[PDB]
């Protein structure tokens, strides 16, 4: 339905897929990274009913479906479900057939190689895309935020890569990859809501807790003092309407969930938190770089939308940082959508038009070409 052969951008996270065309300032549509399947025996004849549901279909019919995510901690393992999501995304809802448009995909720099190789293979072999480019989230986040220099701490759904960039250059020895993300924060919340009498264990229940989290949780700039009153009074609780007419309120669980970002030990991870990893990515860069990264701490990914996160992270780094240095956080409304936006920016830059793999080079080399041409 587009009137120009622009590139397509599709940000396939472990959570949701943001997609639209290159050159825009927003995805045109957002689909979950989900393929749903019925977990019940059909009773009635002539009811239609699919073997599998894709994207928004999977959530729309979720009452009797188990919902699976093809991407685990940022890596695609179920390429067949990815192809279903992409076909739906590109042909039914975004109305852009990849055959007529080059496509840009996104990923952490330490995302295992199979991710970038398989994504490249599917767009060239099942979609016949004329060209491909797998982009890095740290690059995409600095473009979206208007920076060339800074720390990208993407507190997304899958894995946090924590990658410093200076004057457009990677500083790879200072990358701190952390096995903590939004999906784990949600799981922690489900266990503590169980402690309060609200047990959520099935798919519909899990998707609901994620929605509750997104609307009710906040980080708190002082966990212990906030907990001292949240755990003592209803005055710090917030309600949520459950789809069936029941209601839930959340107390210290409201902040304990995001607290895992500062205390990963809450989910069994051996880590001091996202602010220590951010601190180390600044600290491990050269001494003449450190000052610029302290002043350009970039929050990216989702979870950046928990109230107070932009401020607590500046406080936590300031507390670790040397005096004299300016510590500052960048946290635009283009949060959580920053990787997709960076994709749009990058795909359409004149400086990027030589970075695309065409469907010539691809067949001569095979999908492993992504490791030579993209990253």
């Amino acid at each position: 339905d587009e009137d120009e052969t622009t590139a397509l951008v599709c940000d396939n996270g472990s959570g949701l897929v943001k997609a639209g065309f290159a050159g825009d300032d927003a995805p045109r549509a957002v689909f979950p990274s989900i393929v749903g399947r019925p977990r019940h025996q059909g009773v009635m004849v002539g009811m239609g009913q699919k073997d599998s549901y894709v994207g928004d279909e999977a959530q729309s019919k979720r009452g009797i479906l188990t919902l699976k995510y093809p991407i685990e901690h940022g890596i695609i393992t179920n390429w067949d479900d990815m192809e279903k999501i992409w076909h739906h995304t590109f042909y039914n809802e975004l109305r852009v057939a990849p055959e007529e448009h080059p496509t840009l995909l996104t990923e952490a720099p330490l995302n295992p190689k199979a991710n970038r190789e398989k994504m490249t293979q599917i767009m060239f072999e099942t979609f016949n895309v004329p060209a491909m480019y797998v982009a890095i989230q740290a690059v995409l986040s600095l473009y979206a935020s208007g920076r060339t220099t800074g720390i990208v701490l993407d507190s997304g759904d899958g894995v946090t890569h924590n990658v410093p960039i200076y004057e457009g250059y990677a500083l790879p020895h200072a990358i701190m990859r952390l096995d903590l993300a939004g999906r784990d924060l949600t799981d922690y919340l489900m266990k503590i809501l169980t402690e309060r009498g609200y047990s959520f264990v099935t798919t519909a229940e899990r998707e609901i807790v994620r929605d509750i989290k997104e609307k009710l949780c906040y980080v708190a700039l002082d966990f212990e003092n906030e907990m001292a009153t949240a755990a003592s009074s209803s005055s710090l609780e917030k309600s949520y309407e459950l789809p069936d007419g029941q209601v839930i309120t959340i107390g210290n669980e409201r902040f304990r969930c995001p607290e895992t970002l500062f205390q990963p030990s809450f989910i069994g991870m051996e880590s001091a938190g996202i602010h220590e990893t951010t601190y180390n990515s600044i600290m491990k860069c050269d001494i003449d770089i450190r000052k610029d990264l302290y002043a350009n701490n970039v929050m990216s990914g989702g979870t950046t939308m928990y109230p107070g996160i932009a401020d607590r992270m500046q406080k936590e780094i300031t507390a670790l940082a040397p005096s004299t240095m300016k510590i500052k956080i960048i946290a635009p409304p283009e949060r959580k959508y920053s990787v997709w936006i960076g994709g749009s920016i990058l795909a359409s830059l004149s400086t990027f038009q030589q970075m695309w793999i065409t469907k010539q080079e691809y067949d001569e080399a095979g999908p492993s070409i992504v490791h030579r041409k993209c990253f």
């Binding site: 300016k326 500052k328 635009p332 409304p333």
Partner: protein
């Protein structure tokens, strides 16, 4: 609903613009504080160097 949704897109756009104004104004509170401190530091240094120049005088 359309009126609240529209009143919202407008309160929200005015907010994004006010927040942007604040972001940019703050970007400048900070750029000004950086220039103020750079200039105050050059001034204090001019005064340290003056006190030194006067001592060396």
């Amino acid at each position: 609903l359309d009126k609240y949704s529209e009143a919202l897109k407008d309160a929200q756009e005015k907010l994004e613009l006010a927040e942007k104004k604040a972001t940019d104004a703050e970007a400048d509170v900070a750029s000004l504080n950086r220039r103020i401190q750079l200039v105050e530091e050059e001034l204090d240094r001019a005064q340290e160097r003056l006190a030194t120049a006067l001592q060396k005088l």
